[PDB]
Structures are given as C-alpha cells and as structure tokens.
Symmetry: D2
Subunit: 144 residues, 4 copies
C-alpha cells in the first residue's frame, strides 16, 4: 500500500471496518443517511477487477448512489461529526465533491466540520468505524 | 513528486508560495504567530541535504521553533481559518501533533476548524498563500 | 507522477517518445517484431479512461497483440539489446511475463540480456527511443 | 511501504534476508567480494534515524565501503549472475553508479548480465538470498 491513509474523523464506538485490497480507482459510492450517516458501501478497481467494499453500517435512513463517470474523480470531501441521540460522537454529514459536481451534503451538517481538499492526488477508498451508523470515517489517497 | 498534496485551507488573497524540491523528511518548523498565523518557515531533507523553505509571510507576532528529534514525526495537524480585522479569510491557528508531543495551538482558535489526522503516511512539507500573514495553508504527505 | 521510471535499455539513436499522463493500469500491448523489435503500442487507464500510447517505431516485422484479462498483470519483463545492421545498439527482443502466462519472446534473443523481475509493484506504461525500430526501451512502475 | 521492489536476480539457494522498515534514504554500503559477491551490508534512514541492515552473507573476499555524500544518490546498478563452484546460480558481480562516480565492479563480471538504470526514482534499500555468498539480489525504489 503506497497509499496515504487519513483518519479517523468521528468517535470511538462501533467497530473498525477496512479494505482488504490495493485500490487504484474509486468507481461508486452507496451512502445511507438521514439525521446522520447510516452506512457506506463503495466499489473500487484493482488490477482491472471491480471489488465491492461494505456495506458498513446499518440499514436505516435512505439510500443514495454515486456512480462516477470515466474521467470523474473526487477533488474534495467535507463532513461534520458530533452527537446524535445517545451516541456521543459520530459522522453527521458527508459531502463528496468531484471535478464535475457536488454530491450531498448527506445527513445533517450539525457539529464540528472537517474538510479534505485535494490539490494533487486521487481518493481511491475509505475505512471507518461502524455500528448501526457511521461512528467514524477515513480516506485513502494515491499520489497523482 | 509521489506526494499527496492537501489544501488549501483558508482564503484567496496574499500570494501563492510553494516548494521547489522533493522532500522526504520534515526536520524543523519556525512559525510566527499572535492573533493569527503571521509566517511559516521549515527545513526538509532531500537526498541527505537540508533545504530551507520560506520564510513565507510577514515579520509580525512572535516566533516559535519546532525542531523534530530523530524518530519524531507529525501524526496530525489541526487549525482554524476565518476573518481577522480587514482580511476576510486567513489562517487563525495551527496545531502540530507529533508522536511525542503537541506543539501549539499557535495563533487563536477562532473561526472554522480543520483537522488532518494521519493514520498512515508522513508529513514532509507545506505550501500556502502569504501576504503580511498566512492567508492559506496546505500539506504534502508521503506514503509510509 | 508517483511512478518509478526505469530505463533506458538500448542505444542513443532514434527519437525519444514518452507518455503524457498518469497511468494506473496497463491493459494492452501491440508489438511489431521479427529479427528485432520494430514498434510498440500500448493502452493504459487513467481516471477510468483508456488512452492509447504510440504507435512508436516503424511498420516492419509482424504484429502481435497482448490483451490483459481482469486480474492479470505483468510480473517480469526480459529482453536483449545489441547491434543490428547499421544500428549500433537497439532492442533485439522482449518477453512479457504475467501472473498467468508468458508472452514472447518477440524478436530474437541475441545480444546483451536485461531483466526486470517485479517482487512488489505494477508495470503500468513504457517509453523509449524509436526510429524505424525500437532503439531503446523503458518501464514505468507503480507501488502495489 | 510505498516502495517498488525489484528482484530477485540470481539463484534459489541460501536463505532469504530482507529489511523490516520504511527506508527513505540509502547512506552506506559495505560489500565483501572477490570472485563473486560474498556479503552485503547497508545503512538506511527512516524518520531521521539510521538503521543497519545485514551483514548478509559470509566473511570471504575483501571488504569495500561506499559512503554516499549529501546530494549523492544511485542512478543505476549493474551486475552479473551465474554458477560458481558447487552453486548453480549466485551473484558474481555488482556495480553501483551514483550521480557523482562509479563504485565497482565488485566481484568478477562473468555470467549473465543484468542492469537497472533509474530514469526517475531513488534506490533506498536492498534484499536478497544469502548463505556463505550472495545467492540472489534485489532492490527497493522510491518515486522521486
Ligand atoms: C446504537 O448503538 C450501536 O450503533 C452506534 C452507532 O453506530 C455505535 O456507536 C454503538 O457502538 C453500537 O454499535
Ligand atoms: C495586509 O494585506 C496583505 O496581507 C494580507 C494577509 O496576508 C493579504 O490578505 C493581503 O493580500 C495583503 O498581502
Ligand atoms: C530482417 O528483416 C526483418 O526483421 C526486421 C527487424 O525486425 C524488420 O524490420 C523487417 O521488416 C523484417 O521483418
Ligand atoms: C534507420 O534509421 C532510423 O531508424 C533507426 C532505428 O530505429 C534509428 O537508429 C535512426 O536514428 C533512424 O531513426
Ligand atoms: C575464490 O576465492 C575467493 O573468492 C570467493 C568468492 O568471492 C571468496 O569466498 C573467497 O574467500 C576468496 O576470496
Ligand atoms: C555453501 O553453502 C551455503 O552457501 C551457498 C552460497 O551462499 C548457498 O547456496 C547454500 O544454500 C548454503 O547456504
């Protein structure tokens, strides 16, 4: 893994989930959300084969699918973390900004913001902590 | 440059300043600060030679020097951006967290926070926008 | 470009030809050969898009096409360089070894051998020097 | 490890020896040689600390030390492999070419040649197979 791994943003509960591969391209995100981020699932390419990571998190909220077109890639991710109900600190919102459009915000932008603008590099995968919801979130980047 | 380049955090004024090299190790930071971040200067290693980047920014505030010991490296950077006086959006504070201790916060933690926790990788250099102060800030990371 | 670039193997004549991109996957090679290597052409993926490099070299010899399957990647390249006719030093043969099978040798294995076994990494593109034939050859590798 | 790992050149006997670290700079090589390569030892830098790898191999031949100056780095390695005595295939010679001078050849340039010219990158460490002599040899490279 010649990847830079950033994270975690969020809290300490739930369970750590992570990839088992060497991603070079992010092709798809399925995110479940409502008052916070419920779940994440994403597809990546490795040696020309597509692998499905996740679903990580629960089946609450509503689903949205982001299918990146060829030539489309993320240039920034933003989000917010904070309390929800009985959970002290989880991922309340996520926004995915590509070179073509913005996806989100998903969830609700309450709590402490974070932001990852990418001047040079490619976002290729994610990891985090998960229970019924997304407790924490992190990012894998490849040099460009 | 097989480096991941993150940024910019902050505003659009001042002037872009950036490295001209291939850093593999951050050895020293000199930061000037008071109500905000006034200036940045740092030393990096390339092919076993030490290079001095900066000073970028003005000569206001007070100076603090961070000299990393062998075996010491940054595991996270935090900061805040926002208005100062007549400047709409600049870097108000920066905190540098190594595997041994925390340096800062420098400046004042007013405005919008940002945070870059590094789970795998090495911070080796910086860039930004600079006038009399630090208008904007960014980070270079190497896979570990 | 966070790629390791190896080369050149071969001579100093012909004209340098090189990629203008950030390849992350080699999908196809078209090689022209007979007594030496006449030409190279290859396709690579960047941000999910396929780009064609070449053809570099002349229209002599006979053509062979290598189409990598999903999950197939090169683990080694071998070849030979040396004199042919009026050319002091050019690429006489190339062999491409994937995790599934061996392609080649192409050309004739006369002259000085070279070999690039890859223990960890991915070969994603090539460059070289070219006239009527392949004067010289080089390889781009990505960490895996 | 965001390093490209090339190898092995040589035979299948002796015992595999390898680094346990994340090198970013090669500072020193100690090589034992005569009719073949008897042993390798090298120092590398990681997070500003110097670690010694080896000695790998036996105590035959004569010793030579290569101490790289600040700003000096390897641009190519050459060698030869082949039979010697009862050993079917081992490393007969090695030559180390820096941007300032050539070190070697060490050993005897008999057998099958190999060569690793580096157009873009840095050689930061080695591995191999070792018994009384250097059975096999490999190289770690970092993008530059
Ligand atoms: C409802 O509790 C569960 O879900 C939350 C949010 O995912 C976690 O913090 C917690 O550990 C449990 O797994
Ligand atoms: C005081 O004005 C100068 O300094 C500030 C902060 O650096 C910049 O925003 C501005 O463009 C000028 O260079
Ligand atoms: C000897 O001639 C053959 O081999 C050379 C080099 O491969 C080709 O250029 C040529 O067209 C023929 O096919
Ligand atoms: C025949 O002459 C041309 O082709 C050969 C082989 O490619 C080159 O060496 C040379 O510079 C010319 O381009
Ligand atoms: C032929 O003997 C010499 O060369 C071999 C291989 O290099 C060494 O092991 C040995 O000690 C001698 O110096
Ligand atoms: C002499 O026998 C030993 O040394 C040689 C050369 O290193 C190896 O091939 C072999 O496996 C043994 O370790």
């Amino acid at each position: 893994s010649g990847l830079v791994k950033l994270g975690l943003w969020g809290g300490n509960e739930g369970t750590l989930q992570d990839i088992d591969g060497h991603p070079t391209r992010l092709t798809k995100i399925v995110i479940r959300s409502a008052h916070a981020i419920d779940a994440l699932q994403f597809d990546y390419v490795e040696d020309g084969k597509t692998f499905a990571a996740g679903q990580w998190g629960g089946n609450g909220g509503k689903s949205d699918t982001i299918e990146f077109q060829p030539g489309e890639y993320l240039i920034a991710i933003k989000g917010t973390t904070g309390a929800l109900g009985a959970v002290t600190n989880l991922v309340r919102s996520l926004t995915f900004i590509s070179n073509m459009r913005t996806y989100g915000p998903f969830g609700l932008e309450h709590g402490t913001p974070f932001s990852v603008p990418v001047a040079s590099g490619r976002i290729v995968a994610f990891y985090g902590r998960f229970g019924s919801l997304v407790d924490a979130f992190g990012i894998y980047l490849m040099p460009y």
